[model samples]
Target: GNRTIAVYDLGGGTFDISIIEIDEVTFEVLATNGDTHLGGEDFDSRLINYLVEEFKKDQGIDLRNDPLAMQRLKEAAEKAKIELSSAQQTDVNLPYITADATGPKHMNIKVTRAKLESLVEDLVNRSIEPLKVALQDAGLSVSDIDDVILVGGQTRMPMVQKKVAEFFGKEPRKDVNPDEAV
Candidate 1:
């Protein structure tokens, strides 16, 4: 059977939405759209920034200027983001993240899945335009799409999946491992 499928890929460093038509043994790409600067890294950055701001508010110390502290925060943010994919909440704990006149500062924060989604809500929404453009360029509508396949680790986020489902009016196929789908 011939089928029109949309592949929505949101990787660590970029995003892509492609429309393809598969018939028996052959498949042709109909159209593609994406943003080179948008992806999971952007989502992690949002969480990092939020943590930085919160840390500053509570401790009155800005970790953004400390390279080592920033690195630790980045790792913590990424870990929390990934954990949120399956857990309701996770801890972003970085002991002795920085030092001040008073003493060494420890960064310990609890991040909820809801908080992660809120931080990256706009980033998730940003993918929709590309999806729309890909479908339009392919001369197809949401209804014309027979299936939607998600690619990349970022798509594991429930929010991303929900947005794609909402836009396509269908649940996307998860048969392929997102990390290896590329």
Candidate 2:
């Protein structure tokens, strides 16, 4: 039987899918597709917006209009997301997340894995469209796939893995480093 690989690369701010054919003599890519604006960054933004809205509701402030606050929040969101891959929950602690008419403010957020997944579930599932397009362009089907390889930082999310597995009806090969496999 021939060996065919489906590679799903979900990066910080983009998503890509590729179908490849492998043989004893050579390896070749049959088709590829990607979304430039869909990736881990989108997930982070969702969480950040939730944070801003929460702050506004609780402390009467809008962090959305503050670039410095947004920058710090984005960084914290990314770090929390990474930590969540290995833990049930992660804390996003940033003192003085913003300063305004009154005084400096702070953020103490506890985000469970379930909460993170709920925030980005749709974004993770969005990968399916490009995957289907790649396979169609390659004239292949899910059954024809010999392996599904996940790559890029976004793939570390449990939601990404579960959604992709549900798509192909099989587990993904995640032994490779999602960060360096590109």
Candidate 3:
């Protein structure tokens, strides 16, 4: 019997899909596909842009106004975004960030799903482009592919799931975890 391929994927923010074909005796990768910098992290970056805007308003400071501060804030917001997934809310903490000469003023930023989605919705749509490309590369249309699989945390978003379903012209299959296929 030929071995079926198992796709171990961390797709998006660097979309990579790893395929291992079992020899029916030896299991190993026959091929792999992915883009490492294209997953949930990317989406979070999009949401954080909203934070950047809010932060600018609250402190009278813009991230672009300081190169080093912007970099640091980006990193912190990213961490907060990930934490936000498991909770309805999360705090975005910053150390000593203010427009004043003593810029090390602490700030606690809060984010909710509604707020996060508003910022990242456009970016979510952008993320779907690769799927079309990947399907084309495989020489199959969505209908021809037999199944649609989502293989990363970001794909779990309600918006992303709906978009994927709409793209395929069918509801997402309940049988698969999609993000972390069971």
Per-residue accuracy of model 1 over 20-137 as CA lDDT, tens digit each: 7878757688999999999899998999888998899889998878897788788888888998999999888888888889999888888888888888999988989887778778
Q: Could you tell me the lDDT of residue 103 within candidate 3? A: 52
RMSD of each: 2.3, 2.7, 5.2
Could you give candidate 3's per-residue lDDT for residues 60-111 as a string of tens digits? 6666777877778778877766665556777877777655785555667788
Write down the TM-score of every candidate.
Answer: 0.94, 0.89, 0.62
lDDT of 3 at 98: 58
Assess candidate 2 and give its lDDT: 0.83
Where does candidate 2 stray beyond 4 Å?
100-102, 177-182
For each candidate, the alpha-carbon lDDT, in order, equals 0.86, 0.83, 0.61
Order of candidate numbers by TM-score, starting with the best: 1, 2, 3
Using TM-score as the measure, the top candidate is 1
lDDT by residue for model 2 over 1-182, one digit each (tens)?
45888889888878889888877746788999999989777888888887777778888888778888889899998898899998999888999787778898889878898988888888877888888888889998999987788988778777788888988988998886533233
User: Of the candidates shown, which would achieve the greatest lDDT relative to the real structure?
Assistant: 1
Structural RMSD, model 2: 2.7
Candidate 1 vs candidate 3, lDDT winner: 1
The TM-score between candidate 3 and the true structure equals 0.62
